[PDB]
Amino acid sequence: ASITSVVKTSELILKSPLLSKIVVPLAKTYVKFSGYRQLGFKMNDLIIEETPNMQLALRRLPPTESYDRVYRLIRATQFSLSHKLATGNDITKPEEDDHYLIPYILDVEAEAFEKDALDNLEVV
Amino acid sequence: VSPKTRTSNLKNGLTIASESNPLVQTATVGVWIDAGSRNENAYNNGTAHFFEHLAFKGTDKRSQHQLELDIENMGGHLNAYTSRESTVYYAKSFKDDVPKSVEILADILQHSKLAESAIDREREVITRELEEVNKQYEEVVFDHLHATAFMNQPLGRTILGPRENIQTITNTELRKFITENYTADRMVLVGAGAVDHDALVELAEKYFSHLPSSQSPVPLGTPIPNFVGSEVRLRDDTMPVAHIAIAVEGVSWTSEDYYTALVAQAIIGNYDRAVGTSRHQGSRLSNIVSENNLANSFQSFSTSYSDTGLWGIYLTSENTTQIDDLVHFTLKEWNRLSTSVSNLQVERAKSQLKAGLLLSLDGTTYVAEDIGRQLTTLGRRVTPAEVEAKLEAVTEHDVRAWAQKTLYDKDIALVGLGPIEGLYDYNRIRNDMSMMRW
Amino acid sequence: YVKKPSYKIVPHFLGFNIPTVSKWIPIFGIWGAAAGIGALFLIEGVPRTRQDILSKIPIIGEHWIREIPASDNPF
Amino acid sequence: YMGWWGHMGSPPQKGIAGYTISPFAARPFAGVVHAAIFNTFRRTKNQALFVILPVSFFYYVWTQASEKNEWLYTKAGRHELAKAL
Amino acid sequence: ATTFYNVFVKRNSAFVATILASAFVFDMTFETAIDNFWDRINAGKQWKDIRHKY
Amino acid sequence: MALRKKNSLLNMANSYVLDSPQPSNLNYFWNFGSLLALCLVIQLATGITLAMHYTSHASLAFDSVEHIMRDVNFGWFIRYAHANTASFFFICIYAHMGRNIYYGSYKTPRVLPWSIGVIIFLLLIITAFMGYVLVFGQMSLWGATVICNLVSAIPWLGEDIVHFLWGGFSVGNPTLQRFFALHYLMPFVLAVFALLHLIALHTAGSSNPLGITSNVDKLSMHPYYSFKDLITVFAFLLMFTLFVFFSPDKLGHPDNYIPANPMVTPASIVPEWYLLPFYAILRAIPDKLGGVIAMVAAILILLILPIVDRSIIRGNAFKPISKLLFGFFICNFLLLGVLGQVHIEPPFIVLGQICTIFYFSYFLILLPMVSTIENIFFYIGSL
Numbered sequence A: 001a002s003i004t005s006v007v008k009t010s011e012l013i014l015k016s017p018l019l020s021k022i023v024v025p026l027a028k029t030y031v032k033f034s035g036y037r038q039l040g041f042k043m044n045d046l047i048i049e050e051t052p053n054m055q056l057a058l059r060r061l062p063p064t065e066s067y068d069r070v071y072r073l074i075r076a077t078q079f080s081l082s083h084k085l086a087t088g089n090d091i092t093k094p095e096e097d098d099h100y101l102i103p104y105i106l107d108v109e110a111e112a113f114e115k116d117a118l119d120n121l122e123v124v
Numbered sequence B: 001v002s003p004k005t006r007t008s009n010l011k012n013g014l015t016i017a018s019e020s021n022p023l024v025q026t027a028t029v030g031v032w033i034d035a036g037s038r039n040e041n042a043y044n045n046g047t048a049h050f051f052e053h054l055a056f057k058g059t060d061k062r063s064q065h066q067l068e069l070d071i072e073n074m075g076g077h078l079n080a081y082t083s084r085e086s087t088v089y090y091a092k093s094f095k096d097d098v099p100k101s102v103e104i105l106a107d108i109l110q111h112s113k114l115a116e117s118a119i120d121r122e123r124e125v126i127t128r129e130l131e132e133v134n135k136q137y138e139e140v141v142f143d144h145l146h147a148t149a150f151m152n153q154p155l156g157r158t159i160l161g162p163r164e165n166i167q168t169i170t171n172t173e174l175r176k177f178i179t180e181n182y183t184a185d186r187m188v189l190v191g192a193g194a195v196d197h198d199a200l201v202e203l204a205e206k207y208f209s210h211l212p213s214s215q216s217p218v219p220l221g222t223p224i225p226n227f228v229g230s231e232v233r234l235r236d237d238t239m240p241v242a243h244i245a246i247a248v249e250g251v252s253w254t255s256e257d258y259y260t261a262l263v264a265q266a267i268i269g270n271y272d273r274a275v276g277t278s279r280h281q282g283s284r285l286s287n288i289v290s291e292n293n294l295a296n297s298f299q300s301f302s303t304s305y306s307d308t309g310l311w312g313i314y315l316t317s318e319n320t321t322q323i324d325d326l327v328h329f330t331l332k333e334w335n336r337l338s339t340s341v342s343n344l345q346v347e348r349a350k351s352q353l354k355a356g357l358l359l360s361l362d363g364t365t366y367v368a369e370d371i372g373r374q375l376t377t378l379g380r381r382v383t384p385a386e387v388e389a390k391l392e393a394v395t396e397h398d399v400r401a402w403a404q405k406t407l408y409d410k411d412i413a414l415v416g417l418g419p420i421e422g423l424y425d426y427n428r429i430r431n432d433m434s435m436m437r438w
Numbered sequence C: 001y002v003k004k005p006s007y008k009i010v011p012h013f014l015g016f017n018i019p020t021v022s023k024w025i026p027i028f029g030i031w032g033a034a035a036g037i038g039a040l041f042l043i044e045g046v047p048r049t050r051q052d053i054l055s056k057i058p059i060i061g062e063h064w065i066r067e068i069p070a071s072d073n074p075f
Numbered sequence D: 001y002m003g004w005w006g007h008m009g010s011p012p013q014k015g016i017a018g019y020t021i022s023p024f025a026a027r028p029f030a031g032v033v034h035a036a037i038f039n040t041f042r043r044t045k046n047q048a049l050f051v052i053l054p055v056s057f058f059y060y061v062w063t064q065a066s067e068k069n070e071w072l073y074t075k076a077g078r079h080e081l082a083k084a085l
Numbered sequence E: 001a002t003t004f005y006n007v008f009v010k011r012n013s014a015f016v017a018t019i020l021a022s023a024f025v026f027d028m029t030f031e032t033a034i035d036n037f038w039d040r041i042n043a044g045k046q047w048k049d050i051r052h053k054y
Numbered sequence F: 001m002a003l004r005k006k007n008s009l010l011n012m013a014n015s016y017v018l019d020s021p022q023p024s025n026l027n028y029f030w031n032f033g034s035l036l037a038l039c040l041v042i043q044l045a046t047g048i049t050l051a052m053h054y055t056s057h058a059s060l061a062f063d064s065v066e067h068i069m070r071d072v073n074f075g076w077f078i079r080y081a082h083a084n085t086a087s088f089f090f091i092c093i094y095a096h097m098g099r100n101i102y103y104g105s106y107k108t109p110r111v112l113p114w115s116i117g118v119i120i121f122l123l124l125i126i127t128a129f130m131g132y133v134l135v136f137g138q139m140s141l142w143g144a145t146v147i148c149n150l151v152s153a154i155p156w157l158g159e160d161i162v163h164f165l166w167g168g169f170s171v172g173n174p175t176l177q178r179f180f181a182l183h184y185l186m187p188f189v190l191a192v193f194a195l196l197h198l199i200a201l202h203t204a205g206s207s208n209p210l211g212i213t214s215n216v217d218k219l220s221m222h223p224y225y226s227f228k229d230l231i232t233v234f235a236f237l238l239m240f241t242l243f244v245f246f247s248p249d250k251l252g253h254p255d256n257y258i259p260a261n262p263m264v265t266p267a268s269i270v271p272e273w274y275l276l277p278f279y280a281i282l283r284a285i286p287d288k289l290g291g292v293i294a295m296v297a298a299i300l301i302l303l304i305l306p307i308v309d310r311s312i313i314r315g316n317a318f319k320p321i322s323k324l325l326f327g328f329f330i331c332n333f334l335l336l337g338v339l340g341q342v343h344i345e346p347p348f349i350v351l352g353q354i355c356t357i358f359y360f361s362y363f364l365i366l367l368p369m370v371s372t373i374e375n376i377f378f379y380i381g382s383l
């Protein structure tokens, strides 16, 4: 599934008061149990990147954000192989779990989906 | 709505065609001739281009130097080009300098000295032009492409002609050439810009009245070409960019498929990585090429002649290891003209052409070139309304029908110049002219 | 005067649209015939194929009606 | 998508210093007791529910089915078996 | 002749269909033709030729 | 430049077993690939050895297997090793497919090795089965009958195909000899496909348990994974030894020590432990064609995991809901296994049907739905 899909659907939920009231607490618990923060990941580090679109989004990251992503992945790989969890400052605090990549992939995909749409346009 | 193109004849059969634009202050008058390199045989090949040089080498009245001064004093410039089927001699000037320019053009065409001393002088200049076109890769490719596509036929000859001919061209055979070919019934005096038609016809009655008429006056744009599927490879590993042209036998100016072939050409389109917008063009090939950096550029063309044409594509690429992909994808895009095109591509290309055919004409020299080209190839100027009607008549079914008879599984003329090690042999290229899946 | 270009996006899926696919419908037809002809040709030897298909074809079908005389048949 | 040594296709790395020591210089079993007890308990506890829930449910389901099946083929289960067939 | 090319050869689907249908026809006729030929060159030799005695 | 890199042949070996860059954090579930390689090597060695002693003729086949057990030096070992490794091959291959499903190894960019893998899984089933038949005990003959009658499901031509695969009107000598030929052949085909799915994988490299790229942190295949794979080699051989030497018949059916009698089938028909899940599927469906389709579809449906998993995240390490769903799916596949070996009686008939529906609903309903919802929970949950 595309990140665009996921983001638009999430926005539909956050709009509806009823929906957000029941879903936002679920999703926050889900994320706590997911436990990716315990390896010092940001949510966006876990998005599948072996795709044309994502490779392009990752090339668009500012050098700073890109270097830090590499570090978090290296560090998480090291936690994984040691079967340890992050401790202290390595644990991702909720305030640090920023969607650094979502804007870039949404732009990549916006263009890719526009391209598909316009490839199928019919002059009227 | 552009102003009406007025057309008059003289007694000898010279056509005068004019399109006034009272919004501009310059004017391009010139003479379009339905004659070019094609009108030579093999012995005098190169004569037409030779003459173009000698036209400005002085007349019975004005010497070379006097000629130079007369035009400098006019203010504008004179220009000429000889192609295979058409010779043009025009003069861009100011509005009120038009009587001078018509007078100068009439002089250089009728009353050229062609002095043995000047023939001998230009014989070196033209010989040196043979080894300096070498640089203009586009032209080298297209000259080979004609040479191969129309192997040992008049269209296959170059314009400059072989070295051997340049050394043996005499003032006699030059005179004979322009007496046989530059006849009134084969010429069109064209004025665009700040010209009055009635004034231009008077200038033609004054200057071009004693032009020879041919014995057998055929209509303008009257022609037997047998295209050869073939390749020329001019591999040059030292060159950084490969230039490849691929062409099939295309359409003549007067073909029933002329607009269909232009539409088809617009579906494949042009691409140039140096233009900002090109990565976003609708053309399927453009998308493949830009995403994969397969080419620096490609340019579809449909060159027409009186009785045949070439339709094809000209590619440039620095991606020397993926030329196979570049050619593969290009020819697969042509295959889809036969197998896949629908109203989606056809209507898009028609929209882009409906504008394109009118966009081209943006200055007096372009207008004159359009009047002149149309009058010497079709015998009339086709109005924008008629052009819009002929384009509207092109349906998706017509494009598929045309592509299936002209492109699909047809022999190609392929010319490769440069680091084309990666271009496969002729069979593998020609195999891409069909789809086994269809 | 024209204020906006006049178009729609045709429905599409995996880069196929109905205009394009409709142009290939005939070709699937022929390939289906080729697969039919070819498949039937492959199993022309199968006795069931003769019994149930090929012997039923008018005129031509007698090609596949062959009885071994019981004098020459051990089974 | 993956390259090879030298051009693996990592986004450019900068600013990570990696240090390790020789296998001969390290105790391979350092803190093995701690890990074997406390680390394995941690990892087991965290995954326990993902195993326990489906195993316990399908063991319950199997148990109920096997007990019913056993009972149907007793004398007491004659009538319920006759209905089942 | 253009027509024949356009119908049976231009589309590969059509060409392959034509080749397989031709193979069908050839296969059936070749079998029958060789059977008759084989019986003529080995006339009076084969079981079918002496079978009538029994 | 190093010889191992210079020489074309060595360079191919090098690229697979020595310099191959692997993620640094593969856990023990990445070891099944090499165990399946070891099983495949054991099977080839013991198999070719049994082929030197086994006689394919139906009048002699069962007796040649007894001769192997009794007269051939170490024949007992070779026979039991071959039979038991066939069981271990399936433990390892379900483990390996398990690992792949749990960690989303089937997702792009690894759909090709996954899909080739699904074919290896089918070939293993056919190989192991064809090998089961060669003993020509009671279960062997009956198994042959059923597998060769699955093509009767195919309408019209079906019945004739059955006779063609038997080379007779029943399973008999012809069938047994052609099963021998193909059982010898099929493993080499399987080793080709095993190699191919590795070659397909070599474009993307192994996945890893985090499901993130490993391009940031790679380890040479040797020495790290070579030595890691020895641990499981020795753990596998310990389990192998316990079966082969101490309980060689625990994984077997007694009935296969009865010679094939085409006149009776044993009242207790229960196939190999590894075919049991699909056998329960076949029993569940009360239609001939239905039952066969469902059973084959239970394998072929793995081919659609690349489509129906809609997750933006690769694998289940970080997806609590998906992990629970996967746990229930795995346990249901084990329940199907169990139901494959009970008697066809109430209440297990209905239960087997419910488990069959749950098996398919994982691919068709639950996975697409859960993966969609978790996408949304990750995005909302992290804002």
Ligand code: HEM
Pocket (backbone or CB within 6 Å): F029, F030, F031, F032, F033, F034, F036, F037, F040, F093, F096, F097, F100, F105, F106, F110, F113, F114, F116, F117, F118, F119, F120, F121, F190, F194, F197, F198, F201, F205, F206, F207, F208
């Ligand atoms: C003869 C049987 C098989 C052998 C010998 C084999 C061997 C291997 C090996 C050595 C690897 C790389 C290391 C590893 O990840 O364990 C691997 C990876 C893989 N195998 Fe298999 N395999 C076999 C059957 C299968 C089957 C049946 C499937 C799928 C249904 C499968 C799918 C894969 C996939 C998807 C990978 C990539 C997984 C990843 O590393 O993330 N294989 N296999």
Ligand code: HEM
Pocket (backbone or CB within 6 Å): F040, F043, F044, F046, F047, F048, F049, F050, F051, F054, F065, F079, F082, F083, F086, F089, F124, F127, F128, F129, F131, F132, F133, F134, F135, F183, F184, F187, F188, F190
């Ligand atoms: C994946 C590879 C293989 C698998 C999964 C496999 C599986 C089996 C199985 C389950 C049996 C039934 C064993 C029994 O219960 O006695 C068997 C028998 C046999 N296999 Fe294989 N086999 C494999 C490879 C081979 C190969 C390569 C040969 C080479 C000929 C071979 C030769 C035999 C022979 C001769 C028998 C019958 C003798 C016997 O039952 O022990 N196998 N195989």
Ligand SMILES: CCCCCC[C@H]1C(=O)O[C@H](C)[C@H](NC(=O)c2cccc(NC=O)c2O)C(=O)O[C@@H](C)[C@@H]1OC(=O)CC(C)C
Pocket (backbone or CB within 6 Å): F012, F013, F016, F017, F022, F026, F027, F030, F031, F033, F034, F036, F037, F040, F190, F191, F192, F194, F195, F196, F198, F206, F221, F225, F228, F229
């Ligand atoms: C001798 C060169 C020939 C190349 C093929 C030989 C084998 C080969 O490539 O071995 C490798 C060691 C490979 N393992 C891995 O990729 C591997 C990768 C990552 C992690 C681990 N382990 C984790 O902890 C691994 O184990 C393996 O076991 O795959 C066999 C199946 C291959 O056999 C074939 O395909 C051919 C035939 C015998 C099946």
Ligand SMILES: CCCCCCCCCCCCO[C@@H]1O[C@H](CO)[C@@H](O[C@H]2O[C@H](CO)[C@@H](O)[C@H](O)[C@H]2O)[C@H](O)[C@H]1O
Pocket (backbone or CB within 6 Å): D003, D004, F005, F011, F012, F013, F014, F015, F016, F019, F199, F202
């Ligand atoms: C028993 C069967 C006989 C052949 C089996 C042997 C192993 C399988 C090899 C077939 C696959 C070869 O396919 C190709 O080989 C080359 C040559 O090493 C390898 O190439 C790989 O390593 C080399 C250098 O080590 C790198 O330059 C390259 O980027 C990388 O892809 C890859 O593995 C694969 O791209």
Ligand SMILES: O=C1C(O)=C([C@H]2CC[C@@H](c3ccc(Cl)cc3)CC2)C(=O)c2ccccc21
Pocket (backbone or CB within 6 Å): F122, F125, F139, F140, F142, F143, F144, F146, F147, F269, F270, F271, F272, F275, F276, F278, F279, F282, F295, F296, F299
């Ligand atoms: O009735 C059966 C039966 O149904 C299978 C079954 C189970 C697994 C099936 C299978 C599973 C998966 C695939 Cl991809 C193909 C076949 C093959 C047939 C047997 O193996 C069997 C063996 C001995 C006696 C009876 C029987």
